[PDB]
Amino acid sequence: NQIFESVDHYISDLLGYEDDALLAATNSLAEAGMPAISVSPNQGKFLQLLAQLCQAKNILELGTLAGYSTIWMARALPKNGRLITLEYDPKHAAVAQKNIDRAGLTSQVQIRTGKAIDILPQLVEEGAGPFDMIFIDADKPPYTEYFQWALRLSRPGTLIVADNVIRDGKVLDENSTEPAVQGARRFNAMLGANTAVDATILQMVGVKEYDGMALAIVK
Amino acid sequence: NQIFESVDHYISDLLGYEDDALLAATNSLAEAGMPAISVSPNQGKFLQLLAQLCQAKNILELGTLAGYSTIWMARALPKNGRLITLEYDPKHAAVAQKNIDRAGLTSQVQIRTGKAIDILPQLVEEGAGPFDMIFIDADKPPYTEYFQWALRLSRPGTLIVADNVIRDGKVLDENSTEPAVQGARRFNAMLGANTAVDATILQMVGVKEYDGMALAIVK
Ligand SMILES: Nc1ncnc2c1ncn2[C@@H]1O[C@H](CSCC[C@H](N)C(=O)O)[C@@H](O)[C@H]1O
Ligand SMILES: Nc1ncnc2c1ncn2[C@@H]1O[C@H](CSCC[C@H](N)C(=O)O)[C@@H](O)[C@H]1O
Ligand SMILES: [Mg+2]
Ligand SMILES: [Mg+2]
Numbered sequence: 001n002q003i004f005e006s007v008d009h010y011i012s013d014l015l016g017y018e019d020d021a022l023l024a025a026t027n028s029l030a031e032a033g034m035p036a037i038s039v040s041p042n043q044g045k046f047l048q049l050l051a052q053l054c055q056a057k058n059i060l061e062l063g064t065l066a067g068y069s070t071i072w073m074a075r076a077l078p079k080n081g082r083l084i085t086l087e088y089d090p091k092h093a094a095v096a097q098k099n100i101d102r103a104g105l106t107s108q109v110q111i112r113t114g115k116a117i118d119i120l121p122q123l124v125e126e127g128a129g130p131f132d133m134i135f136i137d138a139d140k141p142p143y144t145e146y147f148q149w150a151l152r153l154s155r156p157g158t159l160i161v162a163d164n165v166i167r168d169g170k171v172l173d174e175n176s177t178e179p180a181v182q183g184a185r186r187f188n189a190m191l192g193a194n195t196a197v198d199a200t201i202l203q204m205v206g207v208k209e210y211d212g213m214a215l216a217i218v219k
Numbered sequence: 220n221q222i223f224e225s226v227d228h229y230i231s232d233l234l235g236y237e238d239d240a241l242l243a244a245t246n247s248l249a250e251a252g253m254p255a256i257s258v259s260p261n262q263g264k265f266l267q268l269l270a271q272l273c274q275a276k277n278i279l280e281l282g283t284l285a286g287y288s289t290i291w292m293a294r295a296l297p298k299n300g301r302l303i304t305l306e307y308d309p310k311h312a313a314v315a316q317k318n319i320d321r322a323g324l325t326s327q328v329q330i331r332t333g334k335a336i337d338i339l340p341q342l343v344e345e346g347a348g349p350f351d352m353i354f355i356d357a358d359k360p361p362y363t364e365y366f367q368w369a370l371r372l373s374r375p376g377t378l379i380v381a382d383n384v385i386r387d388g389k390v391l392d393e394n395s396t397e398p399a400v401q402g403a404r405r406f407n408a409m410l411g412a413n414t415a416v417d418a419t420i421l422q423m424v425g426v427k428e429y430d431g432m433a434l435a436i437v438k
Contacts, residue, residue, distance in 0.1 A: 053378060189233070
C-alpha cells in the first residue's frame with residue numbers, strides 16, 4: 001500500500017533528515033551490487049534514539065552491509081564510545097569502511113570481517129562486552145544462536161534489537177519453505193520462551209516491505 | 220487489515236500476556252460506557268519496556284481512561300517510584316482508580332481529576348518534576364501545548380511519547396476538518412521544528428486502526 005510510503009516521507013521530511021554521509025552510504029549499494037535493504041531513514045533515527053535511551057558507550061552490530069544502520073547508531077555515541085560491527089562479505093566490509101570514513105567515524109567504528117558465529121566467541125574471549133545495545137541484523141537462520149551470544153555479551157539493562165522478524169506476515173505460515181521466515185519463527189519462539197529478557201515485537205511499515213523488529217531488555 | 224490483527228495476536232501470544240488486572244481494566248470500559256480506545260496489549264508492553272530503558276522512577280501520563288496504559292507503565296517503577304496520571308472525566312477517573320486498586324498500585328499511582336491544561340501548571344508550581352518518562356494521550360487538539368508543558372517538567376534524557384499522531388494516514392490531508400487530525404498535524408509540525416528534543420514518529424499497525432506514536436528525548 002502507497003499510504004505507508006507516503007506517511008514515511010511525511011515523517012522523514014519532519015524528523016528523518018539524511019546528511020551527505022548517509023546518502024553516500026545508500027548510493028554505494030548499487031555501485032557494489034549490494035541489496036538495498038538498509039534500515040529506512042526513520043528506522044535509523046529510531047535506532048539512534050534507542051542508543052541515546054541506553055546511554056550507549058559500547059554497541060555491537062551483526063550485519064554491516066554499507067554501514068547505513070552503523071552510521072545512525074554510532075552518531076549516538078560519545079567520542080570515546082565504540083561500535084563493533086560484524087560483516088561476512090569482504091566486499092561489503094570494504095564499502096562500509098569507506099562510508100564510515102566519509103562519515104568521520106573511523107575512530108569510533110571497528111568493522112570485523114568473518115562469520116558472526118566465529119567472531120562472537122572471540123569477543124567473549126577478548127572481554128569486549130558488555131555492550132549497552134546490540135543490533136542483530138545478519139543472516140536470519142542463526143538469529144536464535146546470535147541472541148544466546150548477545151546475552152553472554154550483555155549487562156543488566158542491555159537493549160537487544162533484532163531486525164526483520166515479521167517478513168510481510170509470513171511468520172504466521174507454520175509451513176513456510178523460506179529459510180529466513182523459518183529463522184524468524186524460531187527466533188520469535190525462543191524470545192517467547194526466554195526468562196532472561198523482557199521483550200516485544202514492533203510491527204513496522206513505511207518505505208520498506210511490511211516487517212518488524214524485536215526489542216529485548218536484559219533483566 | 221486482517222494481516223496486522225493476525226500478526227498482533229501472534230506477537231501478544233508470545234510476548235503480550237495480560238493478567239487479571241489488565242483484562243479487568245479492559246472489561247471495565249464497556250460496563251462504564253467508556254470508549255474502547257486503550258493502547259493495545261503489545262503497545263502496553265512497548266510503553267513498559269521504554270519506562271525500563273528510562274530507569275523511570277517518576278512518570279507523568281495525560282489521559283488515563285480506565286488506567287490500562289497506566290498499569291503497564293506503573294509496573295516498570297521501583298517500589299518508591301510514582302506515576303501521576305491526569306484525567307478530565309470524573310467517571311473515567313473513578314473507574315481507573317478501581318482498576319489501579321485491583322492491580323495493587325494504589326500507593327504508586329496518583330490520579331488527578333481535571334483538565335491537563337489546568338493541572339500541568341499546578342505540577343510546575345509544585346515542583347513535581349522532573350519526570351523520567353511522559354505519555355501524552357489525552358484530548359488531541361492541545362497536544363502541541365501539552366508538549367511545551369512536558370518540557371517544563373523534563374530533565375535532560377526525559378522520554379516524551381505522544382500517541383495517535385498518524386490517524387490512518389489522514390495527517391497527510393492538509394485540508395482535514397477532523398479536530399484529532401488537525402491536532403496531530405500541528406503537534407507533528409511543532410516536533411519537526413523543535414530544537415529541545417531528538418525525535419521520530421513510529422508508524423503502528425495491529426489490532427487498532429493504523430496510527431503512530433511520537434518518541435522524543437529531551438536534550
Ligand atoms: N554469517 C554472517 N555473519 C556476518 N554477517 C553476515 C552473515 N551472513 C550475512 N551477513 C551480512 O549481513 C548483512 C545483512 S544486511 C545488514 C543491513 C544493515 N544492518 C543496515 O541496516 O544498514 C549483509 O551485509 C550480509 O553480508
Ligand atoms: N482536557 C483533558 N485533560 C485530561 N484528560 C482528558 C482531557 N480531555 C480528554 N481527556 C481524557 O483523555 C483520555 C483519552 S484515552 C487515554 C487512553 C489511555 N492512555 C490508555 O491507553 O489506556 C480519556 O479518558 C479522556 O476523558
Ligand atoms: Mg535488516
Ligand atoms: Mg491513545
